[PDB]
């Protein structure tokens, strides 16, 4: 079984489900700020 673990820097992009567009975008390098 595959495991996806977000325990290192990642990108999060909030997009509409049926449209190629970007509402919000973030790079989380440190979740503790």
């Amino acid at each position: 079984g595959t495991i996806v673990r977000f325990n290192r820097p990642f990108l999060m992009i909030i997009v509409p489900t049926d449209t190629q567009n970007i509402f919000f975008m973030s790079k989380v390098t440190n979740p503790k700020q």
Binding site: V4, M12, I14, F24, S26, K27, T29, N30
Partner: protein, 336 residues
């Protein structure tokens, strides 16, 4: 149309923000920034105007200023839907100095195209003006953005404001009881302890990008919105960032296929960022608007206004039940 420009703009802006602070979290809304600038371009003329539209990544040969503002109008009409478990709202406002004369055309275009409210502000009482704008934003972002405006020149003539509030629930929520303190690697040898949420045996859109050394997964929200997560391999972030292009996003989304995931771990966190976008905008070609040659005569009929500063405040909350994201952009405009 507008979507294509927005994605291009989003990635261009992103790369500039990273260059400014390569070690910090990046949090922003292309939409909030684009909207505020397009709103401002309503009163711009000649080169000032051209630069803004070109800076917003619009192909002025394939689209006209008229089409652009229409796209923003429809966009605003569409977005404002805070009901079906998903709350999404966006508002525009202009705080203008008491007794400053604005062209009727500008005010009308602002109301019908940007749904902008207009508030007469006494910019001479800086402390009062600040609170008014900040309270408007606080109200609009349900309490998330509290201090968008930290200071104002006593020479401020007006401030354009845009805010976006988003609150959605995961289609597949995380059980708080499965959240445990675990390591988040800042670097290969350094880490912090954070609440790591988890989900077991879930089928979601997935794509392992072997070419770019990253994994892409999509976690849908209840409504017409999803969160795309891109996990670069250890030390591959910069490589992925160098490839953040509209064609890359499209390729990723088109390559997504449903796959059974044994386990998924995602940190629970609340982060915020404060930005002075002057440097970034200048780097994107928006220059004249900030100089003595600023041509914003479409606002009052005379070239007596220039942008002094564009700020952006962002907040992101990711937790078991869903996500809350708030953004706000302000364009401070002074006398020229």
């Amino acid at each position: 149309g507008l979507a294509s420009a927005n994605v291009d703009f989003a990635f261009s802006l992103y790369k500039q923000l990273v260059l400014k602070a390569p070690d910090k979290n990046v949090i922003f809304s292309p939409l909030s920034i684009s909207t505020a600038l397009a709103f401002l371009s309503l009163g711009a003329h000649n080169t000032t105007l051209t630069e803004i539209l070109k800076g917003l990544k619009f192909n002025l040969t394939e689209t006209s200023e008229a089409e652009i503002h229409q796209s923003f109008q429809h966009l605003l009409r569409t977005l404002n839907q805070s009901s079906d478990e998903l709350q999404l709202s966006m508002g525009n406002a202009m705080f203008v100095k008491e007794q400053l004369s604005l062209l009727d055309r500008f005010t009308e275009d602002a109301k019908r195209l940007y749904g902008s409210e207009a508030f007469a502000t006494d910019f001479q009482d800086s402390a009062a003006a600040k609170k008014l704008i900040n309270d408007y934003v606080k109200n609009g972002t349900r309490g998330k953005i509290t201090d968008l405006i930290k200071d104002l020149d006593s020479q401020t003539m007006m401030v354009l404001v845009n805010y976006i509030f988003f609150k959605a629930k995961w289609e597949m929520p995380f059980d708080p009881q499965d959240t445990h303190q675990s390591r988040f690697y800042l670097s290969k040898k350094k880490w912090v302890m954070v609440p790591m949420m988890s989900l077991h045996h879930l089928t979601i859109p997935y794509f392992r990008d072997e070419e770019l050394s990253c994994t892409v997964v999509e976690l849908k929200y209840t409504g017409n919105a999803s969160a795309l997560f891109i996990l670069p391999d250890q030390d591959k972030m910069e490589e992925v960032e160098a490839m953040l292009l509209p064609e890359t996003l499209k390729r990723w989304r088109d390559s997504l296929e449903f796959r059974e995931i044994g386990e998924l771990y995602l940190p629970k966190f609340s982060i915020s960022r404060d930005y002075n976008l002057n440097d970034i905008l200048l780097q994107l070609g928006i220059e004249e608007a900030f100089t003595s040659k600023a041509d914003l005569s479409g606002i009052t009929g005379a070239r007596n206004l220039a942008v002094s500063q564009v700020v952006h405040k962002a907040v992101l909350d990711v937790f078991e039940e869903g996500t809350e994201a708030s953004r706000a952009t302000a364009v401070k405009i002074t006398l020229l």
